[PDB]
C-alpha cells in the first residue's frame, strides 16, 4: 500500500492551540525514491478558529515517527486518524511499518554537534493562502528529520508563519504539494 | 493508462477570450491516490495575444467533467484535444472512463447550503510568471470541484489573476506543478 | 530503474564558481509521462561559500544530455556523481540509457529561428529560500531543452537569481519540487 493519510474528511485530528482543535489534511503517496505529499490545515475550534490581534502568528504541527515509521503519540496529529488508505478511510490494522515513507536520513540528517547549522535542503519553504484569498499569504515551512524529542527516529513538521493581521478570521489554508526523498 | 493530457503541441484548444484562442498545456498523471498535474497557458490569437491597458486581469479556464470523468463540451478546453496519452498524441477511442483522475469529492466537496464558505483546501494558489520574466508574477488559482454548472460531477479550474500592467505583451506563463487527491 | 540522482550525500559534485565547489542535490523520479524532480544547491567552498557585496547574484547550473539521455562532461554537474539509484548510492554500470527521464522535445522544443521567443512553458519559476530563512528569497528558474551547446540533445538547467545583499552568508537553499513531461 502506497498511501498514508489522515483521510480527507474534516473530523478534528490535530492540535494548533488545544487538543483536536483542527483538521490536518495530509496525504503521502509513495512514488519510488520520493513521497508526493499534499497538505493543508483548518482550525475547527479554539483560538485559531477566530484569531485575535494577539494570536501567535506561528503554528508548528509536528509528526514524530519511530524507527518503524509509525507515528508517536506525542505528535500534534492524533494516531487514531492516521494510517494506510482503504477507500476514503484507513486500514483496520493499527501498527503498520512505514519506513519507505520516512524522510531519507542521509538527505535530511538529524541535527548534531558535528556541523552547527543544518543543511537548508532539510526544509521546503513557500506560501499558501489564508482563506484562499490571494492577498493573504502564509509561509509554510516543511522540515524533515529536524526533531529529536521523544526519541523520534524521523520527523515531518509543518510550520505556518505570517506577518499580516488576520484577526477575526478562521485559520484555513490552501493545499500545498511537495515531495521528499525516502528512506 | 495513467496519463490524461492535451498533448504537448501548440495547436489551439482553449478559450481565454474567444473560442480556440489559446493553448492549454495540461497533463494529469495518476500516481495512486494522487494525480500529479502540470499546466501552462498560452494565448495564440485574440485579445490576450496582445493585451491592452483594459484587458481583464483575470482569466478562468474551466474543465467540467461528467460522472464518468469525461470532459463536458461546455468546458473552456475543447474535447477534440483531450484524452489518454498515446506517444505524443492521444488514444483513438473518444469516450474513456476517467474517474480515477477526478478530484476526490470528500476532500473537495462541491459547494452547498450546508456550510457557507468552502474549505480552502479545495484550492491551490501560487505564482507563475508571464513571459518567464521574474518581475511579472501572475497568480494561479487551481480549484477542485467548485463548479456546479451544466450538471458537472467534478471540475478542475485554472484562474490566472494579476495586478501589474502587462499591456502589449502576449499572455504566456511558466509551467506549474501540482497534485490532488483522487476519487 | 526509476530514479536518477546525485545521491543524497554532501560530497561536492558541481560548479557554481569553480570546479567542485558545491553540492547539487538532485533526484529525478519517473512517474509515467512525468518526472517528479527535487533539487537544492549548497556551496561548500569558493566565493559562494562566503558571498561578498560583489558576488554575482545569478548562478546557472547546466545539465546537458546526449541523445541517450546520458550526462555530457561539459555539464556543471560531475558525471562521477550522477546515475541510477542503488540504496543511498548509484549503480556500478557508468553508461545507462535514460531517454525516459529526458524532457519532452515537443513540450519543450529547443530554441530555433522558426519562432523568436520560446514558449514560457519551457520554464518553471518560483522562490526558494537562502539559509531556510523566510526573509531571504532566491528565484529558481528551471529550464528544459533550452541549451544547444556541446551538441546536446536535451538539457535541464537550474538558475538562481536574487536581488538582496546576502554578503557574508553561505549559499544554501531550501529544496524545490517540480515535474516535467518526458520524452
Ligand atoms: N530506504 C528503504 C529502502 C528504499 C525505499 O523503499 O525507498 C528502507 O530503508 O527500507
Ligand atoms: N475513487 C476511485 C477508487 C480509488 C482510486 O482509483 O484512486 C473510484 O472511485 O473509482
Ligand atoms: N518518450 C519515450 C517513450 C515514453 C516514455 O517513456 O515516457 C521514448 O522516447 O523512449
Can you put this structure into words, describing what you see?
The structure is a homotrimer of 183-residue chains. Chain A is an all-beta fold and 183 residues long. Chain A has a single domain, classed as Adenovirus pIV-related, attachment domain (Adenovirus Type 5 Fiber Protein (Receptor Binding Domain)). Chain A is built from no helices and 10 strands. In chain A, strand 7 and strand 8 form a beta hairpin. The interface between A and B is medium-sized, with 32 and 25 residues. Bound molecules: glutamic acid (3 copies). One glutamic acid binds next to loops of chain A. Chains A, B, C: It comes from Human adenovirus 26. Chains A, B, C: This is Fiber. Chains A, B, C: It is found in: Host nucleus; Virion.
CATH class wording of chain A: Mainly Beta
What is the number of strand segments of chain A?
Answer: 10
CATH topology category name of chain A: Adenovirus Type 5 Fiber Protein (Receptor Binding Domain)
Q: What is the structural class of chain A?
A: mainly beta
Q: Which pair of chains has the greatest number of interface residues, and how are they split between the two chains?
A: A-B, 32 and 25 residues
Report the portion of residues of chain A in β strands. Answer: 35-45%
Whole-angstrom Rg of chain A? 16 Å
Number of self-contained structural domains of chain A: 1
* Relevant CATH superfamily of chain A: Adenovirus pIV-related, attachment domain
Query: Looking at the structure, what is the overall shape of chain A?
Result: globular
Q: Mind summarizing the main beta sheet of chain A?
A: 6 strands, antiparallel
Widest sheet of chain A: strand order?
A: 6-5-1-2-3-10
Domain Adenoviral fibre protein knob (chains A, B, C): 1-183
Subcellular location (chains A, B, C): Host nucleus; Virion
Binding site for L-glutamate (chains A, B, C): 30, 182-183
Family (chains A, B, C): Belongs to the adenoviridae fiber family.
Amino acid at each position: 500500500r502506497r498511501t498514508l493519510w489522515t483521510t480527507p474528511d474534516t473530523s478534528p485530528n490535530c492540535k494548533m492551540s488545544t487538543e483536536k482543535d483542527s483538521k490536518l489534511t495530509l496525504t503521502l503517496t509513495k512514488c519510488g525514491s520520493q513521497v508526493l505529499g499534499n497538505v493543508s490545515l483548518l482550525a475547527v475550534t479554539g483560538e485559531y478558529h477566530q484569531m485575535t490581534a494577539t494570536t501567535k502568528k506561528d503554528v508548528k504541527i509536528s509528526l514524530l515517527f519511530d524507527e518503524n515509521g509509525i507515528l508517536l503519540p506525542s505528535s500534534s496529529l492524533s494516531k487514531d486518524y492516521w494510517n494506510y488508505r482503504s477507500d476514503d478511510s484507513i486500514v483496520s490494522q493499527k501498527y503498520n511499518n512505514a519506513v519507505p515513507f520516512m524522510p531519507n536520513l542521509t538527505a535530511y540528517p538529524k541535527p548534531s554537534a558535528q556541523n552547527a547549522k543544518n543543511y537548508s535542503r532539510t526544509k521546503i519553504i513557500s506560501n499558501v493562502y489564508l482563506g484562499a484569498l490571494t492577498y493573504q499569504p502564509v509561509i509554510i515551512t516543511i522540515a524533515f528529520n529536524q526533531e529529536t524529542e521523544n526519541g523520534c527516529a524521523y520527523s515531518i513538521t509543518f510550520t505556518f508563519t505570517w506577518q499580516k493581521d488576520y484577526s477575526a478570521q478562521q485559520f484555513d489554508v490552501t493545499s500545498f504539494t511537495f515531495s521528499y526523498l525516502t528512506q
